[PDB]
Amino acid sequence: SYINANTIETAKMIENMTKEKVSNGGVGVDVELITSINVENDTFIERNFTPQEIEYCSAQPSVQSSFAGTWSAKEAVFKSLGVALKDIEIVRVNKNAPAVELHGNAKKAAEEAGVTDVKVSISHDDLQAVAVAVSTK
């Protein structure tokens, strides 16, 4: 009743952020209120998201909660790098962890700080999308 599946997901994400679970790497946490995302504003979605991310998000039950989750994941990954968000691509699969790819200036910026691997976790509900990006050097 009290501990919904969103609070489990976010408590597991913040459990893997502590120094004991992982240390010596770039850590970025971004939250996004889903109400901030406007899916009808096609200029924001085309600018800041890849066509594959838009195709994935549009096929989800809650479209706005998926775009808020992907937007939070891009902003978490950009904070983890520590250096337009279309450069960072998040390939999310059903009942699977999302994977991070860097294409344009983010791919250069990751090589500048000697960042090889970047993982991301996402938890999104009817209020907020929280994303935690851990970048190993």
JSON list of C-alpha atoms in Angstrom, two decimals:
[
{"chain": "A", "resi": 1, "resn": "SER", "atom": "CA", "xyz": [0.00, 0.00, 0.00]},
{"chain": "A", "resi": 2, "resn": "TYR", "atom": "CA", "xyz": [2.67, 2.56, 1.20]},
{"chain": "A", "resi": 3, "resn": "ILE", "atom": "CA", "xyz": [5.82, 1.38, -0.76]},
{"chain": "A", "resi": 4, "resn": "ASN", "atom": "CA", "xyz": [4.67, 1.43, -4.46]},
{"chain": "A", "resi": 5, "resn": "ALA", "atom": "CA", "xyz": [6.94, 0.06, -7.30]},
{"chain": "A", "resi": 6, "resn": "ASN", "atom": "CA", "xyz": [8.25, 3.65, -8.05]},
{"chain": "A", "resi": 7, "resn": "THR", "atom": "CA", "xyz": [9.57, 4.06, -4.42]},
{"chain": "A", "resi": 8, "resn": "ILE", "atom": "CA", "xyz": [11.26, 0.56, -4.67]},
{"chain": "A", "resi": 9, "resn": "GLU", "atom": "CA", "xyz": [12.94, 1.50, -8.06]},
{"chain": "A", "resi": 10, "resn": "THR", "atom": "CA", "xyz": [14.16, 4.97, -6.74]},
{"chain": "A", "resi": 11, "resn": "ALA", "atom": "CA", "xyz": [15.37, 3.43, -3.36]},
{"chain": "A", "resi": 12, "resn": "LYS", "atom": "CA", "xyz": [17.41, 0.80, -5.39]},
{"chain": "A", "resi": 13, "resn": "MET", "atom": "CA", "xyz": [18.83, 3.65, -7.62]},
{"chain": "A", "resi": 14, "resn": "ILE", "atom": "CA", "xyz": [19.93, 5.71, -4.50]},
{"chain": "A", "resi": 15, "resn": "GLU", "atom": "CA", "xyz": [21.24, 2.46, -2.79]},
{"chain": "A", "resi": 16, "resn": "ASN", "atom": "CA", "xyz": [23.69, 2.02, -5.79]},
{"chain": "A", "resi": 17, "resn": "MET", "atom": "CA", "xyz": [24.80, 5.76, -5.55]},
{"chain": "A", "resi": 18, "resn": "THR", "atom": "CA", "xyz": [26.41, 5.42, -2.00]},
{"chain": "A", "resi": 19, "resn": "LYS", "atom": "CA", "xyz": [30.28, 5.14, -1.65]},
{"chain": "A", "resi": 20, "resn": "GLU", "atom": "CA", "xyz": [30.17, 1.40, -0.56]},
{"chain": "A", "resi": 21, "resn": "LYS", "atom": "CA", "xyz": [28.18, 0.25, -3.71]},
{"chain": "A", "resi": 22, "resn": "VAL", "atom": "CA", "xyz": [30.30, 2.39, -6.19]},
{"chain": "A", "resi": 23, "resn": "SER", "atom": "CA", "xyz": [33.20, 4.93, -5.79]},
{"chain": "A", "resi": 24, "resn": "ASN", "atom": "CA", "xyz": [35.85, 6.73, -7.98]},
{"chain": "A", "resi": 25, "resn": "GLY", "atom": "CA", "xyz": [33.65, 7.94, -10.92]},
{"chain": "A", "resi": 26, "resn": "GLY", "atom": "CA", "xyz": [31.33, 10.72, -12.21]},
{"chain": "A", "resi": 27, "resn": "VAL", "atom": "CA", "xyz": [27.89, 10.67, -10.41]},
{"chain": "A", "resi": 28, "resn": "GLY", "atom": "CA", "xyz": [24.91, 12.69, -11.82]},
{"chain": "A", "resi": 29, "resn": "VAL", "atom": "CA", "xyz": [21.30, 12.75, -10.42]},
{"chain": "A", "resi": 30, "resn": "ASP", "atom": "CA", "xyz": [18.51, 14.58, -12.37]},
{"chain": "A", "resi": 31, "resn": "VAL", "atom": "CA", "xyz": [14.75, 14.60, -11.49]},
{"chain": "A", "resi": 32, "resn": "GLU", "atom": "CA", "xyz": [12.09, 16.02, -13.92]},
{"chain": "A", "resi": 33, "resn": "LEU", "atom": "CA", "xyz": [8.40, 16.68, -13.02]},
{"chain": "A", "resi": 34, "resn": "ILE", "atom": "CA", "xyz": [6.50, 14.88, -15.89]},
{"chain": "A", "resi": 35, "resn": "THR", "atom": "CA", "xyz": [4.08, 17.94, -16.04]},
{"chain": "A", "resi": 36, "resn": "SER", "atom": "CA", "xyz": [7.09, 20.05, -17.38]},
{"chain": "A", "resi": 37, "resn": "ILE", "atom": "CA", "xyz": [7.30, 17.81, -20.56]},
{"chain": "A", "resi": 38, "resn": "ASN", "atom": "CA", "xyz": [4.97, 18.98, -23.44]},
{"chain": "A", "resi": 39, "resn": "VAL", "atom": "CA", "xyz": [4.69, 16.09, -26.04]},
{"chain": "A", "resi": 40, "resn": "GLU", "atom": "CA", "xyz": [2.39, 18.31, -28.26]},
{"chain": "A", "resi": 41, "resn": "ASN", "atom": "CA", "xyz": [5.35, 20.82, -28.53]},
{"chain": "A", "resi": 42, "resn": "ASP", "atom": "CA", "xyz": [7.06, 18.92, -31.46]},
{"chain": "A", "resi": 43, "resn": "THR", "atom": "CA", "xyz": [9.91, 21.57, -31.64]},
{"chain": "A", "resi": 44, "resn": "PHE", "atom": "CA", "xyz": [11.24, 20.54, -28.12]},
{"chain": "A", "resi": 45, "resn": "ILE", "atom": "CA", "xyz": [10.84, 16.73, -28.79]},
{"chain": "A", "resi": 46, "resn": "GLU", "atom": "CA", "xyz": [12.55, 16.87, -32.29]},
{"chain": "A", "resi": 47, "resn": "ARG", "atom": "CA", "xyz": [15.39, 19.20, -31.01]},
{"chain": "A", "resi": 48, "resn": "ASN", "atom": "CA", "xyz": [16.37, 17.34, -27.74]},
{"chain": "A", "resi": 49, "resn": "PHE", "atom": "CA", "xyz": [15.48, 13.65, -28.62]},
{"chain": "A", "resi": 50, "resn": "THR", "atom": "CA", "xyz": [16.62, 11.14, -31.34]},
{"chain": "A", "resi": 51, "resn": "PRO", "atom": "CA", "xyz": [13.88, 9.60, -33.61]},
{"chain": "A", "resi": 52, "resn": "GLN", "atom": "CA", "xyz": [14.47, 6.13, -31.94]},
{"chain": "A", "resi": 53, "resn": "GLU", "atom": "CA", "xyz": [13.80, 7.60, -28.39]},
{"chain": "A", "resi": 54, "resn": "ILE", "atom": "CA", "xyz": [10.58, 9.37, -29.71]},
{"chain": "A", "resi": 55, "resn": "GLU", "atom": "CA", "xyz": [9.42, 6.05, -31.36]},
{"chain": "A", "resi": 56, "resn": "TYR", "atom": "CA", "xyz": [10.04, 4.15, -28.04]},
{"chain": "A", "resi": 57, "resn": "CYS", "atom": "CA", "xyz": [8.37, 6.87, -25.80]},
{"chain": "A", "resi": 58, "resn": "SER", "atom": "CA", "xyz": [5.24, 7.27, -28.11]},
{"chain": "A", "resi": 59, "resn": "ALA", "atom": "CA", "xyz": [4.58, 3.44, -27.85]},
{"chain": "A", "resi": 60, "resn": "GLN", "atom": "CA", "xyz": [4.57, 3.52, -23.96]},
{"chain": "A", "resi": 61, "resn": "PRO", "atom": "CA", "xyz": [1.28, 3.54, -21.92]},
{"chain": "A", "resi": 62, "resn": "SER", "atom": "CA", "xyz": [2.21, 6.96, -20.33]},
{"chain": "A", "resi": 63, "resn": "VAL", "atom": "CA", "xyz": [3.94, 8.88, -23.21]},
{"chain": "A", "resi": 64, "resn": "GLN", "atom": "CA", "xyz": [4.69, 11.99, -21.01]},
{"chain": "A", "resi": 65, "resn": "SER", "atom": "CA", "xyz": [6.21, 9.84, -18.15]},
{"chain": "A", "resi": 66, "resn": "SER", "atom": "CA", "xyz": [8.57, 8.08, -20.70]},
{"chain": "A", "resi": 67, "resn": "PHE", "atom": "CA", "xyz": [9.77, 11.46, -22.26]},
{"chain": "A", "resi": 68, "resn": "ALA", "atom": "CA", "xyz": [10.35, 12.80, -18.66]},
{"chain": "A", "resi": 69, "resn": "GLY", "atom": "CA", "xyz": [12.36, 9.59, -17.85]},
{"chain": "A", "resi": 70, "resn": "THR", "atom": "CA", "xyz": [14.49, 9.91, -21.06]},
{"chain": "A", "resi": 71, "resn": "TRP", "atom": "CA", "xyz": [14.98, 13.73, -20.47]},
{"chain": "A", "resi": 72, "resn": "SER", "atom": "CA", "xyz": [16.07, 13.03, -16.82]},
{"chain": "A", "resi": 73, "resn": "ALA", "atom": "CA", "xyz": [18.51, 10.29, -18.12]},
{"chain": "A", "resi": 74, "resn": "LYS", "atom": "CA", "xyz": [20.13, 12.73, -20.66]},
{"chain": "A", "resi": 75, "resn": "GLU", "atom": "CA", "xyz": [20.52, 15.48, -17.94]},
{"chain": "A", "resi": 76, "resn": "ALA", "atom": "CA", "xyz": [21.96, 12.88, -15.44]},
{"chain": "A", "resi": 77, "resn": "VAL", "atom": "CA", "xyz": [24.48, 11.61, -18.13]},
{"chain": "A", "resi": 78, "resn": "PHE", "atom": "CA", "xyz": [25.46, 15.28, -18.99]},
{"chain": "A", "resi": 79, "resn": "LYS", "atom": "CA", "xyz": [26.01, 15.99, -15.20]},
{"chain": "A", "resi": 80, "resn": "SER", "atom": "CA", "xyz": [28.14, 12.74, -14.90]},
{"chain": "A", "resi": 81, "resn": "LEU", "atom": "CA", "xyz": [30.38, 13.90, -17.88]},
{"chain": "A", "resi": 82, "resn": "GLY", "atom": "CA", "xyz": [30.93, 17.26, -16.01]},
{"chain": "A", "resi": 83, "resn": "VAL", "atom": "CA", "xyz": [32.04, 19.27, -19.13]},
{"chain": "A", "resi": 84, "resn": "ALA", "atom": "CA", "xyz": [21.05, 20.61, -27.15]},
{"chain": "A", "resi": 85, "resn": "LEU", "atom": "CA", "xyz": [20.92, 17.13, -25.42]},
{"chain": "A", "resi": 86, "resn": "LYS", "atom": "CA", "xyz": [20.35, 15.15, -28.73]},
{"chain": "A", "resi": 87, "resn": "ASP", "atom": "CA", "xyz": [24.11, 14.16, -28.65]},
{"chain": "A", "resi": 88, "resn": "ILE", "atom": "CA", "xyz": [23.33, 11.83, -25.65]},
{"chain": "A", "resi": 89, "resn": "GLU", "atom": "CA", "xyz": [21.04, 8.93, -26.88]},
{"chain": "A", "resi": 90, "resn": "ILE", "atom": "CA", "xyz": [19.28, 6.58, -24.34]},
{"chain": "A", "resi": 91, "resn": "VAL", "atom": "CA", "xyz": [18.29, 3.20, -25.97]},
{"chain": "A", "resi": 92, "resn": "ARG", "atom": "CA", "xyz": [15.60, 1.89, -23.51]},
{"chain": "A", "resi": 93, "resn": "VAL", "atom": "CA", "xyz": [14.15, -1.68, -24.04]},
{"chain": "A", "resi": 94, "resn": "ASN", "atom": "CA", "xyz": [11.01, -3.17, -22.31]},
{"chain": "A", "resi": 95, "resn": "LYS", "atom": "CA", "xyz": [11.84, -4.83, -18.88]},
{"chain": "A", "resi": 96, "resn": "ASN", "atom": "CA", "xyz": [15.60, -4.05, -19.51]},
{"chain": "A", "resi": 97, "resn": "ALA", "atom": "CA", "xyz": [18.16, -1.39, -18.32]},
{"chain": "A", "resi": 98, "resn": "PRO", "atom": "CA", "xyz": [18.58, 1.69, -20.60]},
{"chain": "A", "resi": 99, "resn": "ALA", "atom": "CA", "xyz": [21.95, 1.98, -22.49]},
{"chain": "A", "resi": 100, "resn": "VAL", "atom": "CA", "xyz": [23.85, 5.31, -23.09]},
{"chain": "A", "resi": 101, "resn": "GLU", "atom": "CA", "xyz": [25.44, 6.29, -26.50]},
{"chain": "A", "resi": 102, "resn": "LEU", "atom": "CA", "xyz": [27.41, 9.55, -27.23]},
{"chain": "A", "resi": 103, "resn": "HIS", "atom": "CA", "xyz": [27.51, 10.70, -30.93]},
{"chain": "A", "resi": 104, "resn": "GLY", "atom": "CA", "xyz": [28.40, 14.44, -31.42]},
{"chain": "A", "resi": 105, "resn": "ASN", "atom": "CA", "xyz": [30.21, 16.77, -28.90]},
{"chain": "A", "resi": 106, "resn": "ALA", "atom": "CA", "xyz": [29.36, 14.48, -25.87]},
{"chain": "A", "resi": 107, "resn": "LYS", "atom": "CA", "xyz": [31.53, 11.70, -27.52]},
{"chain": "A", "resi": 108, "resn": "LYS", "atom": "CA", "xyz": [34.52, 14.15, -27.66]},
{"chain": "A", "resi": 109, "resn": "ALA", "atom": "CA", "xyz": [33.75, 15.44, -24.08]},
{"chain": "A", "resi": 110, "resn": "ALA", "atom": "CA", "xyz": [33.74, 11.82, -22.65]},
{"chain": "A", "resi": 111, "resn": "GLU", "atom": "CA", "xyz": [37.20, 11.12, -24.28]},
{"chain": "A", "resi": 112, "resn": "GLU", "atom": "CA", "xyz": [38.52, 14.52, -22.86]},
{"chain": "A", "resi": 113, "resn": "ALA", "atom": "CA", "xyz": [37.77, 13.39, -19.20]},
{"chain": "A", "resi": 114, "resn": "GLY", "atom": "CA", "xyz": [38.80, 9.72, -20.00]},
{"chain": "A", "resi": 115, "resn": "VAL", "atom": "CA", "xyz": [35.19, 8.40, -19.51]},
{"chain": "A", "resi": 116, "resn": "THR", "atom": "CA", "xyz": [34.90, 4.97, -21.30]},
{"chain": "A", "resi": 117, "resn": "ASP", "atom": "CA", "xyz": [31.64, 3.39, -19.89]},
{"chain": "A", "resi": 118, "resn": "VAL", "atom": "CA", "xyz": [28.49, 5.37, -18.75]},
{"chain": "A", "resi": 119, "resn": "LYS", "atom": "CA", "xyz": [25.49, 3.46, -17.22]},
{"chain": "A", "resi": 120, "resn": "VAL", "atom": "CA", "xyz": [22.11, 5.11, -16.28]},
{"chain": "A", "resi": 121, "resn": "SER", "atom": "CA", "xyz": [19.08, 4.01, -14.14]},
{"chain": "A", "resi": 122, "resn": "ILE", "atom": "CA", "xyz": [15.53, 5.55, -14.57]},
{"chain": "A", "resi": 123, "resn": "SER", "atom": "CA", "xyz": [12.39, 5.49, -12.31]},
{"chain": "A", "resi": 124, "resn": "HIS", "atom": "CA", "xyz": [9.30, 7.41, -13.64]},
{"chain": "A", "resi": 125, "resn": "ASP", "atom": "CA", "xyz": [5.68, 7.57, -12.26]},
{"chain": "A", "resi": 126, "resn": "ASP", "atom": "CA", "xyz": [2.59, 9.93, -12.46]},
{"chain": "A", "resi": 127, "resn": "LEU", "atom": "CA", "xyz": [4.59, 12.81, -10.71]},
{"chain": "A", "resi": 128, "resn": "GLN", "atom": "CA", "xyz": [8.41, 12.66, -11.29]},
{"chain": "A", "resi": 129, "resn": "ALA", "atom": "CA", "xyz": [11.11, 10.92, -13.38]},
{"chain": "A", "resi": 130, "resn": "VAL", "atom": "CA", "xyz": [14.39, 10.40, -11.38]},
{"chain": "A", "resi": 131, "resn": "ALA", "atom": "CA", "xyz": [17.56, 9.31, -13.30]},
{"chain": "A", "resi": 132, "resn": "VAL", "atom": "CA", "xyz": [21.03, 8.41, -11.83]},
{"chain": "A", "resi": 133, "resn": "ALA", "atom": "CA", "xyz": [24.02, 8.27, -14.27]},
{"chain": "A", "resi": 134, "resn": "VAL", "atom": "CA", "xyz": [27.32, 6.68, -13.02]},
{"chain": "A", "resi": 135, "resn": "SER", "atom": "CA", "xyz": [30.30, 7.25, -15.44]},
{"chain": "A", "resi": 136, "resn": "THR", "atom": "CA", "xyz": [33.35, 4.91, -14.86]},
{"chain": "A", "resi": 137, "resn": "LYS", "atom": "CA", "xyz": [36.76, 6.30, -16.07]}
]
